[PDB]
Amino acid sequence: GLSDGEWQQVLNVWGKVEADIAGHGQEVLIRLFTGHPETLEKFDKFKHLKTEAEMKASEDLKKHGTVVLTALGGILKKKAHHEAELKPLAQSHATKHKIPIKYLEFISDAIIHVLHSKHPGDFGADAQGAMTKALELFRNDIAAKYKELGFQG
């Protein structure tokens, strides 16, 4: 992962990206397509763009740059928000409480049991399967943080 300061630095420069997203996106795609022309071959709708000049003149290349950098920014922000939720929990459960993954399994099963007991009319088989999967992701994600922190869970 990234430190808090590092994520701050990523978000600060990304603010500069957002002040001119289309210009940035245009420049990123042109750099990509000039450096690695095979990548431009992936875009059938840019088949008419061959030269740098034509790439710079393209309305739709610029528009696509915006699409790309808007999507990337959102994913980077959402990753950071998730990492920040995991962080304090992994910290303490790895380095202080030392909670094995098998105990996280036991609490996950408890949660499913309680949900079924308290909401049998609204926590059917499908919804139960959804929660079972979400809790497995949660445990896997903590297990990956445990490893980063040096703890074998």
Residues annotated within a binding site: 64, 93
Residue closest to ligand HEM when measured from CB atoms = 92
Q: State the Cα torsion 16-22-23-28 to the nearest 10°.
A: 90
Residue 86, contacted partner among a copy of itself, ligand HEM, none, CB below 5-8 A by kind: a copy of itself
Q: Which two tokens stand for residue 43?
A: 């875009």
Kindly identify the residues of this chain, within the stretch 113-152, that bind a copy of itself according to CB under 8 A.
Answer: 113-115, 117-119, 122-123, 126-127, 129-131, 133-134, 137-138, 141
Q: How many amino acids of this chain bind ligand HEM (CB under 6 A)?
A: 17
**CB under 8 Å to 55, separation ≥6 — which residues?**
29, 30, 33, 34, 46, 49, 61
> 39 with 29: CB under 8 angstroms?
no
At closest approach, how far in Å is the CB of 149 from a copy of itself?
16
Q: At a CB cut-off of 8 Å and minimum separation 6, what does 11 contact?
A: 77, 80
String of contacts with ligand HEM for each residue 27-66, x by CB under 6 A: ------------x--xx-x---------------------
Neighbour-count burial of 90, counting CB atoms closer than 10 A to its CB (0-12 exposed, 13-18 middle, 19+ buried): buried
Verify binding: residue 84, ligand HEM, rule CB under 6 A. Answer: no
Binding-site residue numbers for nitrite are: 64
